[PDB]
């Protein structure tokens, strides 16, 4: 059903200081289920300290025209590249609006980064069962193409990028300051 992707590798060592800074905006999408069709833009702000990742996420739903902030926080893995966070979510400010609800989970993978491109996937979790998964490619620059180290990535799992779901043609609305600002 909602199973997640087996052969996610995550990346030998990451350099963690350069993933784990700055913005990050999702340029290509590829949800594993296939009748997930609204159309999304994603930007995030990863951070990491003593092992432990606190990120500010920012999705924006194309189809409604409606927002939502949140802020995840987990263990990295021995791997440093690979992380599992419980999320809350917030307003524009930081201000915490609903509370986490512990049932609820994300595992992220780092796949693969190169430049200023990286490929990521996602495995959502209800009880520590799978209910989802989705693929990026990552970005710097909104309106940037891949690095050719990430299209090598995709194609070692047999997925080819003409498949995703491309931002660059859609509507996209962006709150650039909730995650340049994340925390400072
Ligand atoms: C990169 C492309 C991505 C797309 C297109 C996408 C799309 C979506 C969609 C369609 C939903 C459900 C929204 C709804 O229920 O109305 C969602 C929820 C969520 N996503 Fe993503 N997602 C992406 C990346 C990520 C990443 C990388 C993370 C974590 C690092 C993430 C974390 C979450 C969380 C925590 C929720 C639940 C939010 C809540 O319940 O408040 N997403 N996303």
């Known amino acids: 059903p909602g199973e997640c992707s087996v052969n996610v590798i995550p990346k030998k060592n990451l350099d963690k200081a350069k993933f784990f800074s700055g913005t990050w905006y999702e340029t290509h999408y590829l949800d594993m289920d296939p009748q997930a069709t609204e159309k999304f833009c994603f930007s995030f702000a990863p951070r990491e300290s003593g ?15 409606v927002s939502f902030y949140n802020t995840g926080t987990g263990p990295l893995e021995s ?5 599992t966070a419980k999320f809350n979510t917030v307003d524009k400010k930081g201000k915490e ?14 796949i693969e980064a190169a430049k200023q491109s990286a490929l990521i996937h996602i495995c959502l979790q209800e009880d520590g069962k799978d209910i989802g998964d989705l693929y990026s490619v990552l970005n710097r620059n909104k309106n940037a193409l891949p690095n050719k180290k990430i299209k090598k990535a995709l194609n070692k799992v047999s997925l080819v990028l003409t498949k995703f779901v491309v931002t660059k043609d859609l509507d996209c609305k962006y709150d650039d300051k909730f995650l340049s600002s994340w925390q400072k």
């Open 97 to 110: 609006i609903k509370p986490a609800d512990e049932k609820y989970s994300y595992t992220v993978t780092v």
């Open 79 to 83: 791997n440093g590249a690979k992380y």
């Open 51 to 65: 092992g432990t990742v606190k990120e500010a996420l920012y999705h924006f739903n194309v189809d409604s025209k």
